[PDB]
mmCIF file of C-alpha atoms in Angstrom:
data_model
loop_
_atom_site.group_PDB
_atom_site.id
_atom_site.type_symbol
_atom_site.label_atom_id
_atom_site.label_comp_id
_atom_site.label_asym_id
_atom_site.label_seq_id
_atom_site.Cartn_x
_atom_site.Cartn_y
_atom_site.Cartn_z
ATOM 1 C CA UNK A 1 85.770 67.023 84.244
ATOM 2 C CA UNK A 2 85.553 70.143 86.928
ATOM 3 C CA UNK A 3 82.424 68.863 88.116
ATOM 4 C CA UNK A 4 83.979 65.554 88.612
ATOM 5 C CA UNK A 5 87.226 67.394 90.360
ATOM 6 C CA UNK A 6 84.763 69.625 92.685
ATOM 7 C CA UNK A 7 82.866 66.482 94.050
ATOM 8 C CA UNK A 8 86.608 64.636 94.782
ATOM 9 C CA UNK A 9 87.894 67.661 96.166
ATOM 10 C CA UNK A 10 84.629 68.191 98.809
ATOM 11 C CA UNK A 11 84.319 64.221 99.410
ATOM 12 C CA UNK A 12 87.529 64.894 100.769
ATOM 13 C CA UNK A 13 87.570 67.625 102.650
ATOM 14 C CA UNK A 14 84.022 66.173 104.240
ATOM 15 C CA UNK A 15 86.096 63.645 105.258
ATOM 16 C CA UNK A 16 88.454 65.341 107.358
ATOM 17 C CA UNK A 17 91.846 63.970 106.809
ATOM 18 C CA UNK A 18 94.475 66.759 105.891
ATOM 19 C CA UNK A 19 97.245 63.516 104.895
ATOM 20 C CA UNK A 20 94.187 61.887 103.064
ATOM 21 C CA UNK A 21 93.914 64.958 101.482
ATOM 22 C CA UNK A 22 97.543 65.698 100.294
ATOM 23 C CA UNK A 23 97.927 62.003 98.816
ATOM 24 C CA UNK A 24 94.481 62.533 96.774
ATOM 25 C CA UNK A 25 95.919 66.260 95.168
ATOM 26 C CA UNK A 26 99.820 64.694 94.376
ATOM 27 C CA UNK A 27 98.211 61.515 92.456
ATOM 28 C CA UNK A 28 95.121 62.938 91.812
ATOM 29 C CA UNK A 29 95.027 66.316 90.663
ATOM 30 C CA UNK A 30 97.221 66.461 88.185
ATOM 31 C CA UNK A 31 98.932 67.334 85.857
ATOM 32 C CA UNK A 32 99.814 70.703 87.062
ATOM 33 C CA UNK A 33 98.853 72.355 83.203
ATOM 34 C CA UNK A 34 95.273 71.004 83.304
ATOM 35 C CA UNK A 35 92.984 74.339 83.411
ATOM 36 C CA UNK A 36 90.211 72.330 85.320
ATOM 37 C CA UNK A 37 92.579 71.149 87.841
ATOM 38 C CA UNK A 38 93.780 74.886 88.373
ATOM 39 C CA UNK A 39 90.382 75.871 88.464
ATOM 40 C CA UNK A 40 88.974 74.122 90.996
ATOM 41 C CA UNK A 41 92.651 73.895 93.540
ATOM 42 C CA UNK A 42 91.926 77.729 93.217
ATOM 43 C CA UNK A 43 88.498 77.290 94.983
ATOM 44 C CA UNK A 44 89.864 74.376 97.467
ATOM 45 C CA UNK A 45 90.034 76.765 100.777
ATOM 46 C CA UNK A 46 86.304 78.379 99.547
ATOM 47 C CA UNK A 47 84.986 74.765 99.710
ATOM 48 C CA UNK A 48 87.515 73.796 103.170
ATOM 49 C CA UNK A 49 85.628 76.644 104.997
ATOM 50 C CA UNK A 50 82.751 75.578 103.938
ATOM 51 C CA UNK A 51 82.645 72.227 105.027
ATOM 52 C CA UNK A 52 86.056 70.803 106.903
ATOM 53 C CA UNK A 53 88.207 70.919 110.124
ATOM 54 C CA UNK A 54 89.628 73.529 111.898
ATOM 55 C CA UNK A 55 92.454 71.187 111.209
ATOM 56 C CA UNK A 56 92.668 71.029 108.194
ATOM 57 C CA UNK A 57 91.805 74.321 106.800
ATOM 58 C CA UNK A 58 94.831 75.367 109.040
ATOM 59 C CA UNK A 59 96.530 72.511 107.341
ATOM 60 C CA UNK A 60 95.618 74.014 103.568
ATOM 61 C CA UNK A 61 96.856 77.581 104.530
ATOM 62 C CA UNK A 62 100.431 76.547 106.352
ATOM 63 C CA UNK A 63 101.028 74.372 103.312
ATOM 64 C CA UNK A 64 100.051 76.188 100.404
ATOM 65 C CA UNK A 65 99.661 80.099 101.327
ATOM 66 C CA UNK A 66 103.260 81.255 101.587
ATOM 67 C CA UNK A 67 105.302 82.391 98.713
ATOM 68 C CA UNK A 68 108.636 81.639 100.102
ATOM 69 C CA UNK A 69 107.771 78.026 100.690
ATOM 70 C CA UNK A 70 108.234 75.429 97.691
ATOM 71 C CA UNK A 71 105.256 72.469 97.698
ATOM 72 C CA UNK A 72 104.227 69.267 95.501
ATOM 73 C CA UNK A 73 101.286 71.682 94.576
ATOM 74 C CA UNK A 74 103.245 74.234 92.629
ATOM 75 C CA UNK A 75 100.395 76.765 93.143
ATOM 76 C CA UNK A 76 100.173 79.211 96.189
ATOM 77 C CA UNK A 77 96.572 79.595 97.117
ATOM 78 C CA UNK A 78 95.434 83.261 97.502
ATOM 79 C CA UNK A 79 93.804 83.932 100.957
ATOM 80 C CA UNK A 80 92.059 86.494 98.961
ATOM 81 C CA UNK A 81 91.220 84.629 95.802
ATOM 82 C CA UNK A 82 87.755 86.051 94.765
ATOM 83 C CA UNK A 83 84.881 83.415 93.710
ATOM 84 C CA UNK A 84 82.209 84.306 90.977
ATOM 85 C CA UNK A 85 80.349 86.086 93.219
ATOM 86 C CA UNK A 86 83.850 88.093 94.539
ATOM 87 C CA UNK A 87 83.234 86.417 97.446
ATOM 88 C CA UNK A 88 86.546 85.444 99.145
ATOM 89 C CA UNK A 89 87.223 82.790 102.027
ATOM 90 C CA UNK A 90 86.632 85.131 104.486
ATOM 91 C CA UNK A 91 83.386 86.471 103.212
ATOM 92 C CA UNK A 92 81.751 82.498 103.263
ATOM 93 C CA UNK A 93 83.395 82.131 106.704
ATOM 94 C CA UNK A 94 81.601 84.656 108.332
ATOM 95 C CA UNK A 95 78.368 84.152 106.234
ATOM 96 C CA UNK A 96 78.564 80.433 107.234
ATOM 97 C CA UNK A 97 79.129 81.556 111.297
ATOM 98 C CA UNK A 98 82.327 79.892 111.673
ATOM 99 C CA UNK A 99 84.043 82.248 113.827
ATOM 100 C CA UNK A 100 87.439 80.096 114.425
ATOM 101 C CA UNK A 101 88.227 80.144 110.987
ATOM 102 C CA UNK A 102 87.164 84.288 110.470
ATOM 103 C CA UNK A 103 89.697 84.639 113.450
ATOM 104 C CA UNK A 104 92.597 82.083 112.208
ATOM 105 C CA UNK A 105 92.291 84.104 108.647
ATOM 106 C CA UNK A 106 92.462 87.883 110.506
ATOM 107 C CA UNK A 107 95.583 86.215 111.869
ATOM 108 C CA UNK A 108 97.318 85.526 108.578
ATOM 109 C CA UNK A 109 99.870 87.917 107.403
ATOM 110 C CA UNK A 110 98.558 88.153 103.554
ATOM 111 C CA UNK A 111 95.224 88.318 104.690
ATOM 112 C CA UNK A 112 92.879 91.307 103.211
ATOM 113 C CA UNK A 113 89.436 91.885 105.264
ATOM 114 C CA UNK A 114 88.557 94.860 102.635
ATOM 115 C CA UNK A 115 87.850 92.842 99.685
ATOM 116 C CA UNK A 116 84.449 93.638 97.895
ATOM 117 C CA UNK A 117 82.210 91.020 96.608
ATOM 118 C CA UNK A 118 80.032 91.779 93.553
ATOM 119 C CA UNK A 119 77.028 93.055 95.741
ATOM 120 C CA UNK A 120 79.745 95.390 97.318
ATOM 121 C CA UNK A 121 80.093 93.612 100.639
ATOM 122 C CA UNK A 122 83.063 93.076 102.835
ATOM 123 C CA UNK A 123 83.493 90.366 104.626
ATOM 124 C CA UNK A 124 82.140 91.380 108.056
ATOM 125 C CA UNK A 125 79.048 92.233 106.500
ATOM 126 C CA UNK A 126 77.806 88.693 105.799
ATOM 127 C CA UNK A 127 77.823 88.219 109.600
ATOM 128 C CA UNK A 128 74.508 87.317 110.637
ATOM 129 C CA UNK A 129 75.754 86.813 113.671
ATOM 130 C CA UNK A 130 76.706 90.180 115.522
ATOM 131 C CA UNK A 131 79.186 88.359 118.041
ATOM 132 C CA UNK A 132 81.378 87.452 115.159
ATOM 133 C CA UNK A 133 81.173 90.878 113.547
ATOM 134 C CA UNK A 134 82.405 92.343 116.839
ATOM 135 C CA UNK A 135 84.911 90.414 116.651
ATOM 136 C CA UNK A 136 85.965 91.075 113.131
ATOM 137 C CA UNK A 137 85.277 94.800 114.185
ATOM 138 C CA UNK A 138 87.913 94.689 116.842
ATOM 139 C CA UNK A 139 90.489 92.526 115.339
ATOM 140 C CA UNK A 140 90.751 95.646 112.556
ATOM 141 C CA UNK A 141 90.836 97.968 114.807
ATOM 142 C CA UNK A 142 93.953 96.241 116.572
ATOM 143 C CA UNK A 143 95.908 95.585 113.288
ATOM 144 C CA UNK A 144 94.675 99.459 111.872
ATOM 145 C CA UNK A 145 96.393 100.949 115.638
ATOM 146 C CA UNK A 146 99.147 98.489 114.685
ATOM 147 C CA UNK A 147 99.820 99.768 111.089
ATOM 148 C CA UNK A 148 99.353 103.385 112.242
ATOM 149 C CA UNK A 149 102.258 102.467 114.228
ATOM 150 C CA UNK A 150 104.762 100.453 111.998
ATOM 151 C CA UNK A 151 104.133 103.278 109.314
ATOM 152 C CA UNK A 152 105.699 106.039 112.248
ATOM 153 C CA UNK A 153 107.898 103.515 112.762
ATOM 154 C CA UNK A 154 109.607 103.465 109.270
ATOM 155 C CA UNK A 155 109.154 107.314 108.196
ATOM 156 C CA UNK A 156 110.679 107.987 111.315
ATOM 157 C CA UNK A 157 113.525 105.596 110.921
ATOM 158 C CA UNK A 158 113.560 106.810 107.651
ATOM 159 C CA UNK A 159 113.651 103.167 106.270
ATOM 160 C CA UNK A 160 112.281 102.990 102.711
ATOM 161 C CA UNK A 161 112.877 99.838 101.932
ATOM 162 C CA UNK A 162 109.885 98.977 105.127
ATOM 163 C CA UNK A 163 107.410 102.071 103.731
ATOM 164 C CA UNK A 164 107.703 100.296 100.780
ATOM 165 C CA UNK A 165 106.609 97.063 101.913
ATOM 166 C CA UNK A 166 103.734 98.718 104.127
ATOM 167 C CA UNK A 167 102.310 100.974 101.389
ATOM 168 C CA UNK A 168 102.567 97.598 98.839
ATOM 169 C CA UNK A 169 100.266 95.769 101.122
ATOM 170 C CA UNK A 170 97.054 95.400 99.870
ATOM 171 C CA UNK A 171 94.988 95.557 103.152
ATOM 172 C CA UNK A 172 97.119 98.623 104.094
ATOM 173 C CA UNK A 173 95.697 100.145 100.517
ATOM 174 C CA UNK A 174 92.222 100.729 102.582
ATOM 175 C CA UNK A 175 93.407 100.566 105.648
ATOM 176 C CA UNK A 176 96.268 102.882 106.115
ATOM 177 C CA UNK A 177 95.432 106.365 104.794
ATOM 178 C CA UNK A 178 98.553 108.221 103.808
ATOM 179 C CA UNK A 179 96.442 111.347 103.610
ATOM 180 C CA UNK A 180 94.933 110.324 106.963
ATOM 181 C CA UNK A 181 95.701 112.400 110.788
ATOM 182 C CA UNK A 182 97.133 109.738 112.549
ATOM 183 C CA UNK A 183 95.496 108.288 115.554
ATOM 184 C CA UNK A 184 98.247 108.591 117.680
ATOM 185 C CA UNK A 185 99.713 111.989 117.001
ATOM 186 C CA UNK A 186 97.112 113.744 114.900
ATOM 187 C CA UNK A 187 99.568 114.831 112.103
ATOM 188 C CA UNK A 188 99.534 113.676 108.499
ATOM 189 C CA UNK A 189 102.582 112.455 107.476
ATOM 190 C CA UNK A 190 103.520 114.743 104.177
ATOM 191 C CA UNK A 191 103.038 118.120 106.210
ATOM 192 C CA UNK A 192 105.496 116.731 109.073
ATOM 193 C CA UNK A 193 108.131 116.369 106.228
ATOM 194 C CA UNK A 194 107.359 119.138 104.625
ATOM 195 C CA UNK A 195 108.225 121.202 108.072
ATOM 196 C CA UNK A 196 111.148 118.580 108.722
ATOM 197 C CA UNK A 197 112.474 119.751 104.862
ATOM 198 C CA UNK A 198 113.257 116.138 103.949
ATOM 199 C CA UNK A 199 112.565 116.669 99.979
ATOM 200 C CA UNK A 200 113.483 113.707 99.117
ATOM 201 C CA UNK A 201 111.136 112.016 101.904
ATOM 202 C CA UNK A 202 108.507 114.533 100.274
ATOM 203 C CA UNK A 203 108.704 113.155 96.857
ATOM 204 C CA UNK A 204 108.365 109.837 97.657
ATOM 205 C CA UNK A 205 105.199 110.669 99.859
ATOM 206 C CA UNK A 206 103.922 112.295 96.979
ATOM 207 C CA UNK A 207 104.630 109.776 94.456
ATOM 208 C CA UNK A 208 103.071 107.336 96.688
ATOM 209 C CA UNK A 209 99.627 109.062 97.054
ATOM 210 C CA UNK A 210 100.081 111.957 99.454
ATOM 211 C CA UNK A 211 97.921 114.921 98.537
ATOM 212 C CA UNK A 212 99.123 118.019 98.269
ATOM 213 C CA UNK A 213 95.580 119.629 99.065
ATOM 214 C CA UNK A 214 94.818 118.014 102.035
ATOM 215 C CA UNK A 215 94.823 120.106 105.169
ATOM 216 C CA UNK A 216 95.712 118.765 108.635
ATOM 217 C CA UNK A 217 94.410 118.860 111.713
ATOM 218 C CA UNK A 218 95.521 122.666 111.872
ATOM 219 C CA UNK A 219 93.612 122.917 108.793
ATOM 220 C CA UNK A 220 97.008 123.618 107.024
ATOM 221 C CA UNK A 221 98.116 122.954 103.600
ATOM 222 C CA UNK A 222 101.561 121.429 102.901
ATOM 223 C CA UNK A 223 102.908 124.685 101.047
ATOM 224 C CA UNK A 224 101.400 126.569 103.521
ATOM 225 C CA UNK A 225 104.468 125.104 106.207
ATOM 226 C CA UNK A 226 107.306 125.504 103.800
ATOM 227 C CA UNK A 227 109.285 128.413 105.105
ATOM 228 C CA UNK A 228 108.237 132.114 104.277
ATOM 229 C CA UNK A 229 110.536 133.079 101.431
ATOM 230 C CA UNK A 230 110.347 135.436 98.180
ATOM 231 C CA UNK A 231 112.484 134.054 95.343
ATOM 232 C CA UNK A 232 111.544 131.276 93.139
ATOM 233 C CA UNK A 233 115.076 130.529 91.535
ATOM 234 C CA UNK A 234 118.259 129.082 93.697
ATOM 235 C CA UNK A 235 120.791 130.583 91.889
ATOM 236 C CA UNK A 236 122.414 132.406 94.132
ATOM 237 C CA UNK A 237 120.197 131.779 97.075
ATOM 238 C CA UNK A 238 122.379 128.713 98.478
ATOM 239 C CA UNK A 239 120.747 129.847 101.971
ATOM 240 C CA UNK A 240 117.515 129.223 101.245
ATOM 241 C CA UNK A 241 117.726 126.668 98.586
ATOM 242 C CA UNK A 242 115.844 124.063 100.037
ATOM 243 C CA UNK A 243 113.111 125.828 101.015
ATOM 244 C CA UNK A 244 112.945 126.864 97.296
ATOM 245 C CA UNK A 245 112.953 123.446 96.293
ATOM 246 C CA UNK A 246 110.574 122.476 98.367
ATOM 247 C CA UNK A 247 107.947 125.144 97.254
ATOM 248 C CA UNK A 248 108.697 124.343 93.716
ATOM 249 C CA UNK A 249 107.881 120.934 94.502
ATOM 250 C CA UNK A 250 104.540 121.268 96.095
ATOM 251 C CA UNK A 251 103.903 123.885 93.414
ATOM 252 C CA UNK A 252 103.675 120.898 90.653
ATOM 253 C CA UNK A 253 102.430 118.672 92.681
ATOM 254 C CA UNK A 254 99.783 120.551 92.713
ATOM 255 C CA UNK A 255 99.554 120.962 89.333
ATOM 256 C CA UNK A 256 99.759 117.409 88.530
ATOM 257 C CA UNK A 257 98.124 115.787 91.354
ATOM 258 C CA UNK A 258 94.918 115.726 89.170
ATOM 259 C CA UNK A 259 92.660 113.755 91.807
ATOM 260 C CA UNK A 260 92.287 116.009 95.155
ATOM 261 C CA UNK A 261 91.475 113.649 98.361
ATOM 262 C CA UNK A 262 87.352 114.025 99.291
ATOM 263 C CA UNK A 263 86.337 114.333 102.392
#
């Protein structure tokens, strides 16, 4: 029965027609329970890149792609869904030369360019042709000087409800490096709270993958900027308090850290 759904699904999409399309999945490929039926919807935009429109694989992605949109489907494709081989849609699209639809994909906000296949690959490595890569190349770079960017912006604003969204992407997961010097600035994030004395900013930079043994690009540790004081206890050092805090914090976090960043 999925070999009879795969060779409806790509007779269709060979075709052309995005309505055609939409009337042959709501009468169909159903019901919606059928494990084939999932199965092979799952793998629709592999096989679209592989051998429809520019239409309508645009067509597929604006219908079916975002979560905050209900649809006849009742399934939101992944961008990123992963075939056998781990390949995603991405990874055939720029095997297969089709640079419109590696560009249209870049474009999408869920999209994720770092996925490995099972031979290890990303995407822009299947590019045989170099144009394309370039491309691909460039197009990270942008949204990587972009990201760089919104991630100031919202430390800075001190708006945790947007770092949380930006560190929850999964293309920012490989892509923005909390531990990182910024482009832009050169600092690294933790040590420019640590000298701020935001704790609570601290903690959640810690809990969220900031290393306490990195060193920035002054080659300093974060304890090493937390202000030069003696005691360890704050009782009766109000004054100073913070800065006590503070040094107890990075203390166990680097106790507990357990993984130190390699590079």
């Amino acid at each position: 029965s999925k070999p009879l759904l795969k060779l409806k699904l790509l007779d269709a999409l060979r075709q052309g027609s995005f309505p055609n399309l939409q009337d042959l999945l709501k009468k169909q490929f159903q019901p919606l329970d059928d494990p084939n039926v999932q199965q092979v919807l799952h793998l629709m935009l592999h096989y679209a890149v592989q051998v429809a429109p520019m239409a309508v694989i645009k067509e597929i992605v604006h219908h079916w792609v975002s979560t905050t949109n209900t649809t006849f489907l009742n399934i939101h494709l992944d961008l990123n869904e992963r075939d056998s081989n781990g390949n995603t849609p991405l990874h055939i699209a720029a095997y297969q030369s089709r640079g419109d639809i590696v560009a249209f994909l870049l474009d999408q906000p869920t999209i994720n360019d770092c996925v490995l296949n099972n031979s290890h690959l990303q995407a822009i490595e299947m590019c045989k042709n170099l144009n394309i890569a370039q491309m691909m190349q460039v197009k990270r770079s942008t949204y990587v000087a972009e990201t760089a960017q919104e991630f100031r912006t919202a430390f800075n604003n001190r708006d945790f409800g947007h770092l949380e969204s930006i560190l929850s992407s999964p293309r920012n997961a490989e892509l923005l490096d909390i531990n990182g010097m910024d482009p832009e600035t050169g600092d690294t994030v933790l040590h420019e709270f640590v000298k701020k004395r935001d704790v609570i900013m601290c903690r959640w930079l810690l809990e969220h993958g900031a290393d306490p043994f990195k060193r920035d690009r002054k080659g300093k540790l974060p304890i090493e900027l937390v202000r030069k004081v003696n005691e360890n206890d704050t009782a009766t050092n109000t004054k100073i308090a913070i800065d006590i805090e503070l040094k107890k914090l990075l203390e166990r976090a680097t106790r507990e850290q357990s993984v130190i960043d390699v590079t």
